[PDB]
Structure formats: C-alpha cells, structure tokens
Amino acid sequence: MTEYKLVVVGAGGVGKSALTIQLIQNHFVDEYDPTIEDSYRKQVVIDGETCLLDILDTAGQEEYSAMRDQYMRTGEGFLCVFAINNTKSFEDIHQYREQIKRVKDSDDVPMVLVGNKCDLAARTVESRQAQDLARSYGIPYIETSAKTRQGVEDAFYTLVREIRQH
Ligand SMILES: Nc1nc2c(ncn2[C@@H]2O[C@H](COP(=O)(O)OP(=O)(O)NP(=O)(O)O)[C@@H](O)[C@H]2O)c(=O)[nH]1
Ligand SMILES: [Mg+2]
C-alpha cells in the first residue's frame, strides 16, 4: 500500500511525541519522556485510501542533529511543531524549516505548521502570528492539543494530503 513517511520536528517539549501517541494510541502522555528517535507505523484509511503512516518522532535535543538529519532526509512530509505557550519554540521553527529545506534540497517540501498545546490558557504565541508565518512559508497552519485530541488527526491528515498533491 501507499506509505507516507511523516516526520515530526520541533523544539524539545512542544509535544511532538504526545501528538504522535495521541494519533497512534488515542491517549495523552502526561509523562516526562524525552525522545531520542522513535518510529510508529499504523495502517489507516484516509479519504478512502488504505495507506501506511510511517511517523518519525524526532528529538528536540540539539545533540541529535545528526540523527535528525539522517531521518529528515527520508521524510516526505514534516510536522513543524511549536507550543503556543512557548515563544522560543515558535522562534525555533524557522531553524527547523531551513534545516528541512537543506537536507531535502527543496524549497517546497510538504509541511504543516503545528501550534500545539492550544488547550492551555497561558498563550504567548498569537494565532495571527503563527498563521502569518505559515502563510509566508506557503504551508497550512493547524492548532492542536494532544491533551484534548483537538486537531491531531487534522494535522497529520492535512500533511498526507499535501504529499498527494505534491
Ligand atoms: N497541556 C498540554 N500538554 C501537552 C500537550 N502536548 C504535550 N504536552 C506535555 O508537554 C510535555 C512534553 O511532551 P512531549 O510529547 O514529550 O514533547 P516532545 O516535543 O516530544 N519532547 P522531546 O523533543 O524531548 O521528545 C509533556 O509533559 C506532555 O504531557 C498538549 O497538547 N497540551
Ligand atoms: Mg518526544
């Protein structure tokens, strides 16, 4: 079947793993559990097409840029995740996107800007700012909460749809 290699990237602690585990295992991981490098494979039906989501959950730690560079190279689409309560992670987004473009040798890689932890009331990144950033990237912006599952399927499925029309 069609396989979509999705890569989740972003600063440490923004909820990359929580988003992935919510998608694959339908539960919120309320646990401190830093990722080194984890792969998830799930058979899903998306818009009637049986496909295999191969999700690459990367580390936010800078000490694993080498492991990120290797598995960013093979990814077809990228979830660039920041936390709406963490302004620094929103600023780090530009660094992750530039790194994706260099390893992919491409200015138009399938990507979704993900503003995670939107359940939190102490927002520091206005939705308008992140939407403008996504607009200048030419990529969709989707706010998610791995806690409430809001937007989780939307973020991943939108990325798959970008890969189809790429
Ligand atoms: N309130 C709330 N907390 C969240 C959300 N997503 C993740 N978290 C919390 O944020 C913390 C970090 O989550 P985690 O998924 O491990 O983030 P990460 O980006 O994978 N970190 P790393 O880069 O080290 O792997 C955890 O305590 C987790 O429960 C969310 O949508 N809402
Ligand atoms: Mg993680």
Coordinates of C-alpha atoms and ligand atoms in Angstrom, one line a residue:
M1 CA 0.0 0.0 0.0
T2 CA 1.0 3.6 -0.3
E3 CA 3.3 4.6 2.6
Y4 CA 3.6 8.2 3.8
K5 CA 6.9 8.9 5.7
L6 CA 5.9 11.7 8.1
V7 CA 8.5 13.4 10.3
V8 CA 7.6 15.3 13.5
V9 CA 10.2 18.0 14.3
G10 CA 10.3 20.9 16.7
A11 CA 11.9 22.2 19.9
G12 CA 12.1 20.0 22.9
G13 CA 9.0 19.6 25.0
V14 CA 6.5 21.1 22.5
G15 CA 4.6 17.8 22.3
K16 CA 5.9 16.0 19.3
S17 CA 5.6 12.6 20.9
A18 CA 2.3 13.5 22.6
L19 CA 0.8 14.4 19.2
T20 CA 2.1 11.1 17.7
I21 CA 1.0 8.9 20.5
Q22 CA -2.4 10.5 20.6
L23 CA -2.8 9.7 16.9
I24 CA -1.5 6.1 17.1
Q25 CA -2.7 5.1 20.6
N26 CA -5.5 7.5 21.3
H27 CA -4.3 8.7 24.7
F28 CA -2.5 11.7 26.1
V29 CA 1.0 11.0 27.5
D30 CA 1.1 13.2 30.7
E31 CA 4.7 11.9 31.3
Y32 CA 8.1 13.4 31.1
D33 CA 9.7 11.1 28.4
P34 CA 12.2 12.7 26.1
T35 CA 12.6 11.1 22.7
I36 CA 15.8 10.1 21.1
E37 CA 14.3 8.6 17.9
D38 CA 11.1 6.5 17.6
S39 CA 9.2 5.2 14.6
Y40 CA 5.5 4.5 14.5
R41 CA 3.7 2.6 11.8
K42 CA -0.1 2.4 11.5
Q43 CA -2.4 1.2 8.8
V44 CA -5.1 3.8 8.3
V45 CA -7.8 4.7 5.8
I46 CA -7.6 8.4 4.8
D47 CA -10.2 9.6 2.3
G48 CA -10.9 6.0 1.3
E49 CA -7.3 5.2 0.6
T50 CA -5.7 2.4 2.6
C51 CA -2.2 3.7 3.5
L52 CA 0.6 3.2 6.0
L53 CA 1.6 6.1 8.1
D54 CA 5.3 5.8 8.9
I55 CA 5.7 8.5 11.5
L56 CA 9.2 9.5 12.5
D57 CA 9.2 11.1 16.0
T58 CA 12.5 13.1 16.4
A59 CA 14.2 14.6 19.4
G60 CA 14.1 18.3 20.2
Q61 CA 17.6 18.0 21.8
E62 CA 20.3 19.6 19.7
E63 CA 22.7 16.7 20.5
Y64 CA 20.7 14.6 17.9
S65 CA 21.0 16.9 14.8
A66 CA 22.9 14.0 13.1
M67 CA 20.1 11.5 13.8
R68 CA 17.5 14.2 12.7
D69 CA 19.5 15.0 9.5
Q70 CA 19.5 11.3 8.5
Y71 CA 15.8 10.7 9.0
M72 CA 14.7 14.1 7.8
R73 CA 16.3 13.2 4.5
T74 CA 13.9 10.3 4.0
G75 CA 10.7 12.0 5.2
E76 CA 8.1 13.1 2.6
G77 CA 6.2 15.4 4.9
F78 CA 7.1 17.3 8.0
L79 CA 5.0 18.4 11.0
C80 CA 6.9 21.5 12.4
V81 CA 5.6 21.7 15.9
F82 CA 5.8 24.6 18.4
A83 CA 4.0 25.2 21.6
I84 CA 1.6 28.2 21.8
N85 CA 2.8 28.8 25.4
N86 CA 6.5 28.7 24.4
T87 CA 7.6 31.7 22.3
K88 CA 11.1 30.3 21.9
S89 CA 9.8 27.2 20.2
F90 CA 7.9 29.3 17.8
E91 CA 11.1 31.2 17.0
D92 CA 13.0 27.9 16.6
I93 CA 10.6 27.0 13.8
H94 CA 12.5 28.9 11.2
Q95 CA 15.6 27.0 12.2
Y96 CA 13.9 23.6 11.7
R97 CA 12.3 24.6 8.4
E98 CA 15.6 25.8 7.0
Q99 CA 17.2 22.5 8.1
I100 CA 14.5 20.5 6.3
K101 CA 15.0 22.5 3.1
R102 CA 18.7 22.0 3.1
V103 CA 18.6 18.2 3.7
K104 CA 15.7 17.8 1.2
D105 CA 17.3 20.2 -1.3
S106 CA 13.9 21.6 -1.8
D107 CA 12.1 24.9 -1.1
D108 CA 8.6 23.3 -1.4
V109 CA 8.6 20.3 0.9
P110 CA 5.2 19.1 2.2
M111 CA 4.9 20.7 5.6
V112 CA 2.3 21.7 8.3
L113 CA 3.0 24.3 10.9
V114 CA 1.5 22.9 14.1
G115 CA 0.7 25.1 17.1
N116 CA 0.4 22.5 19.9
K117 CA -0.9 22.8 23.4
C118 CA -3.8 25.0 22.3
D119 CA -5.8 23.7 25.3
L120 CA -3.5 25.9 27.5
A121 CA -4.9 29.3 28.5
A122 CA -1.4 30.9 29.0
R123 CA -0.9 31.5 25.3
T124 CA 2.2 33.5 24.3
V125 CA 2.1 32.9 20.6
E126 CA -0.9 34.6 19.0
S127 CA -2.6 32.6 16.3
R128 CA -2.3 35.5 14.0
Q129 CA 1.5 35.5 14.2
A130 CA 1.8 31.7 13.5
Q131 CA -0.8 32.0 10.7
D132 CA 1.3 34.8 9.1
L133 CA 4.4 32.7 9.4
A134 CA 2.7 29.7 7.8
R135 CA 1.4 32.0 5.0
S136 CA 4.9 33.2 4.2
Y137 CA 6.0 29.5 4.1
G138 CA 3.1 28.6 1.8
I139 CA 2.1 25.9 4.3
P140 CA -1.1 25.3 6.3
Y141 CA -1.2 26.2 10.0
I142 CA -3.2 23.9 12.3
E143 CA -3.5 24.4 16.1
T144 CA -3.5 21.1 18.0
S145 CA -3.9 19.8 21.5
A146 CA -2.5 16.3 22.2
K147 CA -4.4 16.6 25.5
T148 CA -7.9 17.0 24.1
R149 CA -7.1 15.5 20.7
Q150 CA -8.2 18.7 19.0
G151 CA -6.7 19.0 15.6
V152 CA -4.5 15.9 16.0
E153 CA -5.9 13.9 13.0
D154 CA -6.3 17.2 11.1
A155 CA -2.6 18.0 11.4
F156 CA -1.4 14.6 10.2
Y157 CA -4.1 14.0 7.6
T158 CA -3.5 17.5 6.1
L159 CA 0.1 16.6 5.7
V160 CA -0.8 13.4 3.9
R161 CA -3.0 15.4 1.6
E162 CA -0.1 17.8 0.9
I163 CA 2.1 14.8 -0.1
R164 CA -0.6 13.6 -2.5
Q165 CA -0.8 16.8 -4.5
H166 CA 3.0 17.4 -4.4
Ligands
LIG1 N1 -1.4 20.7 28.1 C1 -0.7 20.1 27.2 N2 0.4 19.5 27.4 C2 1.0 18.8 26.4 C3 0.5 18.8 25.1 N3 1.3 18.0 24.3 C4 2.3 17.7 25.1 N4 2.2 18.1 26.4 C5 3.0 17.9 27.5 O1 4.3 18.5 27.2 C6 5.4 17.7 27.8 C7 6.3 17.3 26.6 O2 5.6 16.5 25.8 P1 6.4 15.6 24.7 O3 5.4 15.0 23.7 O4 7.3 14.6 25.4 O5 7.2 16.7 23.9 P2 8.4 16.4 22.8 O6 8.3 17.5 21.8 O7 8.2 15.1 22.2 N5 9.8 16.5 23.7 P3 11.2 15.8 23.0 O8 11.8 16.7 21.9 O9 12.2 15.7 24.1 O10 10.9 14.4 22.5 C8 4.7 16.5 28.5 O11 4.6 16.8 29.9 C9 3.4 16.4 27.8 O12 2.4 15.8 28.6 C10 -0.8 19.4 24.8 O13 -1.3 19.5 23.7 N6 -1.3 20.1 25.9
MG2 MG 9.3 13.3 22.2

